[PDB]
Motif scaffolding. Sequence first.
Motif, mmCIF file in Angstrom:
data_model
loop_
_atom_site.group_PDB
_atom_site.id
_atom_site.type_symbol
_atom_site.label_atom_id
_atom_site.label_comp_id
_atom_site.label_asym_id
_atom_site.label_seq_id
_atom_site.Cartn_x
_atom_site.Cartn_y
_atom_site.Cartn_z
ATOM 1 N N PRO A 1 0.835 -1.206 0.000
ATOM 2 C CA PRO A 1 0.000 0.000 0.000
ATOM 3 C C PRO A 1 0.867 1.254 0.000
ATOM 4 N N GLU A 2 0.485 2.199 -0.846
ATOM 5 C CA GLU A 2 1.280 3.404 -1.060
ATOM 6 C C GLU A 2 1.401 4.202 0.234
ATOM 7 N N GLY A 3 2.612 4.675 0.510
ATOM 8 C CA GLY A 3 2.845 5.575 1.612
ATOM 9 C C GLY A 3 2.916 4.922 2.973
ATOM 10 N N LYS A 4 2.839 3.598 3.058
ATOM 11 C CA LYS A 4 2.806 2.907 4.337
ATOM 12 C C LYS A 4 4.195 2.407 4.716
ATOM 13 N N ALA A 5 4.420 2.290 6.025
ATOM 14 C CA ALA A 5 5.696 1.830 6.530
ATOM 15 C C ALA A 5 5.805 0.310 6.556
ATOM 16 N N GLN A 6 4.749 -0.422 6.234
ATOM 17 C CA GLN A 6 4.818 -1.874 6.159
ATOM 18 C C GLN A 6 3.985 -2.330 4.977
ATOM 19 N N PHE A 7 4.407 -3.425 4.354
ATOM 20 C CA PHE A 7 3.520 -4.032 3.374
ATOM 21 C C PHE A 7 2.585 -4.993 4.098
ATOM 22 N N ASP B 1 -6.649 0.533 -7.793
ATOM 23 C CA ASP B 1 -5.781 1.435 -8.550
ATOM 24 C C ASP B 1 -4.331 1.373 -8.071
ATOM 25 N N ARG B 2 -3.518 2.363 -8.452
ATOM 26 C CA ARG B 2 -2.070 2.271 -8.216
ATOM 27 C C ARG B 2 -1.677 2.390 -6.752
ATOM 28 N N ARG B 3 -2.612 2.708 -5.866
ATOM 29 C CA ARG B 3 -2.283 2.701 -4.451
ATOM 30 C C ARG B 3 -1.925 1.316 -3.922
ATOM 31 N N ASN B 4 -2.319 0.250 -4.613
ATOM 32 C CA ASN B 4 -2.124 -1.100 -4.108
ATOM 33 C C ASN B 4 -1.464 -2.003 -5.150
ATOM 34 N N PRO B 5 -0.196 -1.754 -5.483
ATOM 35 C CA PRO B 5 0.574 -2.777 -6.199
ATOM 36 C C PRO B 5 0.636 -4.044 -5.360
ATOM 37 N N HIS B 6 0.614 -5.197 -6.026
ATOM 38 C CA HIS B 6 0.574 -6.454 -5.282
ATOM 39 C C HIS B 6 1.088 -7.586 -6.152
ATOM 40 N N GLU B 7 1.326 -8.714 -5.485
ATOM 41 C CA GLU B 7 1.920 -9.882 -6.115
ATOM 42 C C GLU B 7 1.385 -11.125 -5.423
#
Lengths: 219, 20
Positions: A160-166, A182-188
Amino acid sequence: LPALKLALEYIVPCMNKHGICVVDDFLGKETGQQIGDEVRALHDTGKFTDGQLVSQKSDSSKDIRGDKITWIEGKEPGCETIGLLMSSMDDLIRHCNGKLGSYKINGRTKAMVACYPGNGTGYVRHVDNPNGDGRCVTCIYYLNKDWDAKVSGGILRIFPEGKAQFADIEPKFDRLLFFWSDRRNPHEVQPAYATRYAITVWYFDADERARAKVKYLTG
Amino acid sequence: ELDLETLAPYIPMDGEDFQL
């Protein structure tokens, strides 16, 4: 679970503050197991085909996502409990109307039933809706009884964008997940070493989806 | 920068979407 309370007192504030919301034990064991059986029936009868990408280019889709999928409307014979899942998802979203960011959610995709068939398959880091195709919320239901992620992998990792942990989401039985598409949440999807099932619907924002449809219809 | 649509999961753009 009562949809109004769950939507307004949990899903809404969690989505607005974090962009990710986990609801464990969504439907209960009996319903979750019936869904698992319907999914395994789809798998066993050859319904799954390779997962596809929005823009296909030189590379094999399997270099990107190693899952096999089918699309379910909810009314098909042998898919009744998947349809109940979908209706329960829809009920939560309707009770969230107008409280998820500035979106106005009027529709959704069909359900994507997806299987990563062990063997180290996964999905490289990506964004669900990077270029404005209308998808605003990804909703995923997991149905993997006995999943031990420390051995079988298959963790959905979201950055998550801007967060200190995934955020690491195990694909746990009867777990429901929402996140902004949207792009706030790149993921795999990290490599899976056992058969991993999940059902996804994407909810559409009305105005963005209208613009995306206009683009498609005009070339 | 990479075209992220080449990594994004496909959804149908034609037909209808399911209306809520």
